[PDB]
């Protein structure tokens, strides 16, 4: 098994911000600052990827706390993502293997309460729900004016 | 439908870096400047995921031209997901409605040449091979000393 794999430690910093220190694990160690947030050298595609989910659950948690009457306090998420590849003729393909959600709440609430706001963000995380079943996605090739299957 | 859209325009650069210019469209229109590359206010988490997806495809692209006999020039990615969301009692839930990815490769070559390049680059791209299955994410809730399922 050839793998890829990402780790991501995020911290709730802010009102909304989290901050999210992703690294490469395989094939070489690489590290990465990143952060999302809302109100109003580049890192590889897949340090974006994992940076989104983490954020997304992170939002969600953050968002959900108080309504479903939840205390959290220093909010700490910690996501690992395993893909595997293979040899293709003069190229590879892809796949996933594993995804990993270590969630840290600090809250001085019953065990029950925090397992509901995590399914309850769970199922509000966008990218959590995308990942959760297979997505068509449809390629197209400009030809001229004009856009064909590919 | 009440739904949440982001577009992504990317842009080919340099020798392995991609230009990325995210908008969300719907709630609302906002716009953030990313990149990703190979070699060596935050955004919302959605923004760092469409990054993501369109920067992987583009990879494998400019990756896999010259190997599978392909000329590139300037290549444009334009890719739009589409979700939604619903009430559920105090907060919501969501899921995908619609991935679609456009590709512009101002290629000289045989259009069957360029469809092969698309797909293999499709089957290379580890978040393309993700999103096309569904996926299992374990969580865990820190507990003392243990992590117990979430």
Redesign the interface.
């Known amino acids: 098994r050839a793998e ?1 794999v990402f780790t991501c430690n995020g911290k709730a910093v802010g009102k909304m ?2 901050e999210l220190d992703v690294a490469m694990v395989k094939p070489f160690e ?1 590290r990465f600052a ?16 994992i ?3 983490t ?2 659950v992170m ?1 969600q948690i953050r968002a ?1 706390a108080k ?2 009457k939840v205390t959290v306090t220093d909010l700490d998420v910690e996501c690992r993502v395993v ?1 595997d590849w293979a040899k ?1 003729g ?7 293997k ?8 600090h809250s001085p609430d019953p ?1 029950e309460a ?2 509901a706001l ?3 963000a ?22 001229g004016d004009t ?2 299957d ?1």
């Open positions: 890829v911000r989290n690489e990143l952060a999302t947030d809302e109100g109003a050298s580049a890192p590889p595609p897949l340090a974006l990827f940076a989104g989910l954020g997304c939002t959900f309504r479903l893909w293709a003069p190229v590879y393909e892809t796949g996933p594993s995804f990993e959600i270590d969630i840290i709440l065990i925090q397992q995590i399914e309850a769970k199922k509000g995380c966008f990218l959590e729900q995308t990942l959760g079943q297979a997505n068509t996605i449809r390629h197209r090739l400009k030809v856009f064909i590919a």
